[PDB]
Every structure is written in C-alpha cells, then in structure tokens.
Amino acid sequence: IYVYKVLKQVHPDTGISSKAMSIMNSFVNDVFERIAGEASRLAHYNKRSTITSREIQTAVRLLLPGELAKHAVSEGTKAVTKYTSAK
Amino acid sequence: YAIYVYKVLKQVHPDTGISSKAMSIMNSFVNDVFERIAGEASRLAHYNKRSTITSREIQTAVRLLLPGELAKHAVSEGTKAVTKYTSAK
Amino acid sequence: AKAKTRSSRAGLQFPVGRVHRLLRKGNYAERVGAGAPVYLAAVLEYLTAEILELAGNAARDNKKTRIIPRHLQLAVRNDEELNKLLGRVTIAQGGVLPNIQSVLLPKC
Amino acid sequence: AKAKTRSSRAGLQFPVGRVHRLLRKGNYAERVGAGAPVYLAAVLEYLTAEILELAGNAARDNKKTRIIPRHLQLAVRNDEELNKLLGRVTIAQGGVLPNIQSVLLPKC
Amino acid sequence: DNIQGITKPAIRRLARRGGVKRISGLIYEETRGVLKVFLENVIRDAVTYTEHAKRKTVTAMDVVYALKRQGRTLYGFGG
Amino acid sequence: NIQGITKPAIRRLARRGGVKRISGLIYEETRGVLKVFLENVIRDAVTYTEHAKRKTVTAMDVVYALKRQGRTLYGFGG
Amino acid sequence: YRPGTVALREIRRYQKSTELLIRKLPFQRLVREIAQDFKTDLRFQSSAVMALQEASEAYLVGLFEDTNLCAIHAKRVTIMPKDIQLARRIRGERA
Amino acid sequence: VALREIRRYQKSTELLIRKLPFQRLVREIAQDFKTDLRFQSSAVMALQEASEAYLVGLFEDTNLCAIHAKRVTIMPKDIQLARRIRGERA
DNA sequence: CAGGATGTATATATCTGAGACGTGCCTGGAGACTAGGGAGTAATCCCCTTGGCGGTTTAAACGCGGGGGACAGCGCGTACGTGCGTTTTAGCGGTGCTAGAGCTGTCTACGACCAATTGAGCGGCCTGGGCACCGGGATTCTCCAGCCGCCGGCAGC
DNA sequence: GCTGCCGGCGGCTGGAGAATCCCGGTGCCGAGGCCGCTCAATTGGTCGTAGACAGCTCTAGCACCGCTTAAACGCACGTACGCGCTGTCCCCCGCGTTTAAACCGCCAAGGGGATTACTCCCTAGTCTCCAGGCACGTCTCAGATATATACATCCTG
C-alpha cells in the first residue's frame, strides 16, 4: 500500500508490475537492516542503552553518500519537528 | 585476555614469550573472531525464528565461517568439551 | 477516544508503528527512543520516492506505462551517487548498460 | 560448600563466565543456552593455540625467544588457509612476504 | 559428464553480451571451471543452511541468504 | 603539505611493492590516490568524533572507521 | 559481410535484451549433480534454481567485461586465458 | 642496485614516509571538515601504516598488471586499469 | 572515389487475455489511558598530555651530468577464428500422476531468570635482573672487465 | 688451394664493492610477588519456550510424446597474431650540496574523565476499534503477433 501511495504521489498515471515491487520491498528491507544495525552499533559503541534520532542521523550521514545524505537530514529534521510540535 | 594466552604459551611453548604489540594484536584478533561468531549465531537464532542461542547455533556458525580443516577440528573439540562438561557437573 | 495514527501526525505515508515494533523486536538495543522510527520512516520514504520517480521517468522515456526491472536497472545505473550505493547489488532481470569500447568499431 | 570455576570442570583455560557475561550483555539474543559459552571458549582456545604455535615455530626459526608481530605476519601469510581466513586484515609492523617476479630477474 | 552441457554458443552469446569482438577456444573450459567453483561455493552454504533448519527442501530463501552472506546480495526474490 | 610525500618515499614504496623500473608519471597519480584515501577516512573519523561530542580523534574511532571501510586494523585496541 | 560485422550486430542486439542465456534443464541437472556431493536425497525449488542461474550469469558477465579490459590493455581485440586469470587474480578471489 | 633495494625493503617493517610531513598533510586535509581539531598520536601512526599497506598493495597489483603487459615499466594507464578492476574508482 | 542491390532494421494493424486495481470481510495489533524508577543530564573538580617554544647536528633530498638499453614503430610470415551451409539432436510442453515432505495445533516439562551470600582471580604497582642493541673487525660473497687460446669465415691463389 | 687476419667467444683471473658474524659492552622492561575488591560461583524457587505427537495437504519429481529449434560438423579465407629489425630518448645512477627532520628540554592549560543529585521518559499493564491482509472478480489497456517501409553495406564502374 505504502509504495503504491508513493508512486501515486509522484506519478499518478504510471503503474508498476509485480516483481518490480518485490524488488522495492527487498531494497527497503535491506536498507532498513543496514541502517538499524549501524545505529545499534553506534549506540553500543558509547556504552549507551537507548536509540534516538542522533545515532540514526549519524548512521544516515555515514551510509548515504553526500547529496542524498544532506537531502535526507533536512527532511528528517522537519519530520521530527512536526511530530514534536504536535504530539 | 592476557593471562589465558600466557597460560596458552606456557602449555605450548614453555620457553617462549610474547611481545606487548603481539599481545594487543592477538587480543584484537580474538575479540574480532568472538564478535563475528556471536553476530552470526544471533543472526541464525533470529533467522530460524528462535529466541535462545544454543550449542547448535554455535556449531552451525563455526561450520559456516571457518573454511576447511579448522571447521572439523573446531567442531570435534567443541563436542568433546561440552560432553566432558555435562558428564562432570 | 478519537484514535489518531502516528503517521498522520508525522505527515508520512509510512507505518511508523510497524517500524517501532520492528526496532523493539529486532534486538538492536535494550531500549528505543521516540523519534528514531519517525526518522527511519522519513528517510525510507525519501529514498523510495526518489527511486520510484527515477524509474517512472525511465519508463516514460521508453514510451511504456508500467514499470519493469529493466527500467529499474537503467535508472539505477545511470546515477553515480546511486551506483555507489547499489554497486554490490544485482537486480532480477535487470540486464546491462549498452556500451562498446571505442576501439572495436570500424575505421569510419 | 566449596566453589570452583566452570573452566576447571570444563577442563579449559578460557573464562566460561566472562564469555557468558559477554553473551548476556552482548545484545545478541534474549536468552542463551549453557553449552554455547563452553563451545565458544573451546573454539577460541583452539584458534589461539594453533596461531600461537604457528608464531612460535617461526620465532624459534629466527632464533628469538619472544613473538614479534612480524612473526605473526609470517605465520598467518605462510598458511594459505589462514591467509584466506585473514585476507583483509592488516597487521601492524608486519611488512610483506618476500617475492620477486621471474622476468625481473636477469637472464642467468 | 554434464558440465559440458554449457554449450559453446551459449558462452559466445554470453561474451557478446559482455561485448567481446573475438573469442579464442581455450576459454571455454576455464569459464566452466570458474562456474563450478561459483556454484559449489554457493550450494555448500545453501545445503548447510537447510541442514541447520533440518529440512529436506532447499528454497530460494537459503540460496539468496548465502549469496548475500558472501557480499553478492540479489533483489527480486523476496529478500 | 601534499608535496611532503617526497619522491624517494614513493620510490621505496614501489620497491617494496616489487617493481623494477619506474616512469615519470606515477608520482602525481599516486599522490592523488593517497589524498583520496586520506579524505575517505577523515570524513567518517570526524563524523565519529563529532557524534561522541569529543574534540580529540582517538585511535579507537579511526580503527572503527577502517573496519567500516572494510580493512580492519590490529594492534590499536579492538 | 566483412568479418566482425555480424559480431557487432549481435553485440548491439543482445545487450539490450534481458532474458537468460542457458537452457533451464541443463542448469537444473548441473545443480542437482553438484548437490549430490554435499547431501543426497534432497529436494530443490525452482526459485532457487533461477536464483543460482541469474547469479551465475551476473558473475560471468562481470568476469567478461574485466577480460575485455585486460584484452584492450593487452593491445589486442581477441581474448586469451592469461587475461581471465589476470582479472581473477587482481580482484583477489584466487589470491 | 634496484634489485638490491628490492631485496632490501622487502624484509623490513618500519614505515617509509616521514612522520611530520604526513601529520601536516593529515591536519591540512582534516581542517576542512572541522576546525580546531586535536589528533591523538597513535591514531596518526595507525592511519599512516594503513595507508602504507593500501599503497603497497596498489603498487604490487600495478606491477603485476604491467608484467602481464609484457613491459618492465609501469605507467598511469596501468594504475587506472587496476583501480577499475578492483572496483574502487568506478 | 561516386551509384545499386541487398539483407537488415524501422514502423503499424488487429488479437487478446492474465492480473493490477478495486471491493468487500474479518481480525489482531497499535493508539488511548494509568505510574515508576533508573538512564541520562548538567554541574563539579581533578588531572594530563599536547600543542608549543627554541639549539644542535646529521642523515637525507636534489639538480647535474653522463650513460646505455627498453620501448614503440614498421614490416612480414602464417594460421585459426569467422561467416555460412547441412544435418540432427535435444529442449519445450502439455497432459496426468503419485506419495513425500512441509505446516500447523496441543499438551507437557524442564531449564534459563532472577534474587540473596560469600569467597577468590586478578588488575594494579614496584622490582632485579635478564635478553636484545650496537661497534668494529675479520670473513666471506658475488659482480665486473680484461687476457687469452681457440675458432670460423675472409681477402687474395 | 692455404696464409694471414680478424673479429668474436667463451673460459678463466683476479680485483672491486657488498653482505655477514661474533665479540664486548650496555642498557630497558617482560615477568613475578602483594593487596584487596569486585564480580563470579551456590542455593532456591517459576513459569514459559521448546520439544514430542498428531494430524492435514500442498507440491515436486516421473513419464510421454509431438514439434521444433538451436547445436554440431565441415570449409574457404582473410584478418590479426606473433616475431624480428631498428631508431632513439628517457630513466639509472653517482656527486657535490643544500637542507630539514629528529632529539632534547621545559610550560600552560583546555580538554577528557570520574562523582553526584535528580527528573522525567520509555517501559510495564489493559481496552478498544480500525487499518491491513486475503479471497475474489473483473475488464482492462497492457502485452503479443503478424503485416508494411527506410537503412548502412559491399560490390561495381
């Protein structure tokens, strides 16, 4: 559902196939693991016990190369402030 | 892991020592290997939808990473060690 | 009453609660904060939106309505920043980028 | 009653308790068994013993009484299987195996 | 006597996809050799995964899992 | 500071590599590769140090950075 | 046609397509034969068969463009085995 | 004498680049990411020797490629080819 | 050095029909609504180790200059990979067919969790003496360039 | 024919710079005893994952033949390989020298790290109802064929 809505929000007149969506699902799952394990290792590196936005931000800067990283950080910041502004 | 390794030398080479740099290097070695084995074992324990890490997971891990002769020597000593552990409580 | 989902308040199209459950049950850390799943959902939405938009533009350039993995490969391999991220990844029925070394063509 | 270490009962010179503690606060799994720390200690002990014997052989070859990371490099790189196991690992003060390509040598 | 089932035009087609202009005759066996080393490397992990799972059928999950373990992860198979 | 890599330094490095003859154009190419590899480690090194709110680049952070890149280091802790 | 013209035509023809190059049945037989050496009396899923198939295709395609680079560096147009083992050695699998 | 040096450095282990110029280069390249940075000493030699290992591996790969090219001299095209094959430049 | 005939590619008209897209049903998990108690957070102080300074001195880089051989270019022998025709031989498949291995639900039981005591393993901190470091000098160890006896053409007859 | 003659040819001789060994003195610093504390072994109990049994059942390998399409064998041939001659000009390799790293010593202090009172944030516990997965069910516009023209070659004059 969510990938379909993402497609509709950018291309409302473009469809997708079946296997080409399983590819997207595998990609998202792989990136989720690659970021979550990284954030967990940063959390354990400083002898910490909680995972917050700072560790995930550092993992994003580490993983995403350059321009994608700086684009991601801004959107994540606005996304976290709209959450904190109105719970 | 300094003292255990020193006992290892004294049980292998009673007349050979070890430098401090070698000590730190092989300490990092054992830490790296432990982390690799534990990570693979935890990965398998989650991968087969279980919640307890047992000797079977460690056995699969050692059979999985160490290539060749090390694999069967390691599994042989693992089984013999756990058997003498359980036989003599 | 008046239940409200976290995705709506976060302005996202992603199941933030599902990501929070995955983090809790994934054995990454003993305790998990609050904004980490929101940030993860946001970055995932960004990257998947960029990927899907590139694939859609490639499909439109190929004069085809739906999206196939061939267009996925053409869109992924044509962006070096994306290429480095997906350098060690192969896609089912993706094909290769059509290229020829300049030497083996005839003289003129 | 009189207490005794787990390693003595297990006939090992590696710390069963320390390995168990590392597994427990290692975040790896919620619960662990009893034979897993013993197995891990045994395999670590075997690997350390074999690597230290391989270093000691070279140390006595070079007529020295203590191990130098250079000897560790020789022991690791002179065993092809161990080189495969330790291919990407770089050793401090290890140098490189001596090697000269055949053509670079003179005619006779 | 089955590895020879990888016919010569198949290798020629594969190399033309690679983009070669001329093809020798001595590469047809070295390509087969690298092929079998690839496959036995993958299927040893694939079989040991099932053995740990103590089943008798090898699914796509085990093979893709082992492929990703070597650092050659592949999408499109329910990863 | 890039020129601090003197010509005999790369010469002896290549001799350790196992080369016999050296032309006159490897020198700046080597310096560029050296600089690129340096920045590729300083980036995540300063990232790690900034994450910990510290101002000193400890050896632990750089060995972690080398491990992340895929080339582990032995001797400096672990 | 002049020699190599058909080669160019096939190069431009086949790099655009994406379908497989090896017949399914021989590859299945090869995989089954190899699987006997590790554990006999097994059962295979077709999904795994095509996964192995496409992985093999990707690696061989990789090795072929590396061989092409070796051949062009060798001031040649043909491809020779020294190139294929050079490409295997530089990458480091056979190190 | 070139082969004599080949015999000479292949047995030793110490670093082959002066410490202070390397430290100056590291500080010069690190000032751009952040200003007023302090470097621990051991990290400097760790980075130095890691770079030495990387570079000597690159040299050995390039020499192997050059001897494959039926030549005794190494040229930048060999280095670019080796980088392309190893999968680093592209 | 400019045209012609050609096997190629390109476009374009119906077929034509498995399955993205709704459309509902139903269910289980995520939000709404209660403390708590322990993980982090400033605030503090107390080391510490690091950037910095300024004489020697001392091994190392560098521009110069001479030299010799590795390499790119060009030419020629030559042999084997390619374009193409003729079998022929194996893959696709479509049809059933069979039991085997995979999946899930229930009942039980035993082993990891955790709390409270009690004892020793070892990390630290001196400490004496033990094994590498360095110097010179004698001992070999190869590397080179010329002398020389021998040899196979080379002008004559 | 047969005299010299001439240049190489390798075989040998010996001088040449290089690498190695051990003695002899001098340190620097892994290895060992001590103290105590801090965490690890022992008891004692629980309650819930994990193993068994017991079913259901979806599914993968067999076989079977009709068709056919790509694979194997052969065959002129010309192009791309491999080798040999060659003309340098571009690195190597000592030398004077000019220079910058390394030691060596003494400081200040901004930053790293251990303690401490606390507070307030995610976890622990239930209820509830609504978003999402599954079973269909279509009618599509998504494909697929088969048709018809331009094109870039290799020959000709």
Residue numbers in the entry:
A (entry chain M): 36 to 122
B (entry chain S): 34 to 122
C (entry chain K), D (entry chain R): 12 to 119
E (entry chain Q): 24 to 102
F (entry chain J): 25 to 102
G (entry chain O): 41 to 135
H (entry chain I): 46 to 135
What do the authors of the reporting publication say about this deposited model?
Analysis of the cryo-EM data of PRC2AJ1–450 bound to the H3K36me3-modified nucleosome resolved two distinct states at 3.1-Å and 3.5-Å resolution, respectively. In the first state, the H3 tail can be seen binding to EZH2 and entering the EZH2 active site (referred to as ‘tail-engaged’), while, in the second state, density for the H3 tail appears absent (referred to as ‘tail-disengaged’). In the tail-disengaged state, no density is seen extending from the histone core and interacting with the structural elements that channel it to the active site. Further comparison of the tail-engaged and tail-disengaged PRC2AJ1–450–H3K36me3 states revealed that the tail-disengaged complex is rotated with respect to the nucleosome interface by approximately 12°. In addition, the CXC domain in the tail-disengaged state now contacts the major groove of the nucleosome DNA at superhelical location (SHL) 6.5 (while it contacts SHL 7 in the tail-engaged state). Importantly, this alternative binding geometry in the presence of H3K36me3 reveals a unique interaction mode of PRC2 with chromatin that is incompatible with catalytic activity and highlights the sensitivity of the H3 tail-binding pocket within EZH2 to the surrounding chromatin environment. Our tail-disengaged PRC2–H3K36me3 state now shows a variable interaction of PRC2 with chromatin that is not productive for activity.
Polycomb repressive complex 2 (PRC2) trimethylates histone H3 on K27 (H3K27me3) leading to gene silencing that is essential for embryonic development and maintenance of cell identity. The interaction of PRC2 with substrate nucleosomes involves mainly two structural elements within the catalytic subunit EZH2, the bridge helix and the CXC domain. A central mechanism of PRC2 activation is the recognition of PRC2-trimethylated lysine peptides by its EED subunit, resulting in conformational changes within PRC2 that lead to the allosteric activation of the complex. We discovered that H3K4me3-containing and H3K36me3-containing nucleosomes inhibit PRC2 using two distinct mechanisms because of the differences in their positions along the histone H3 tail.
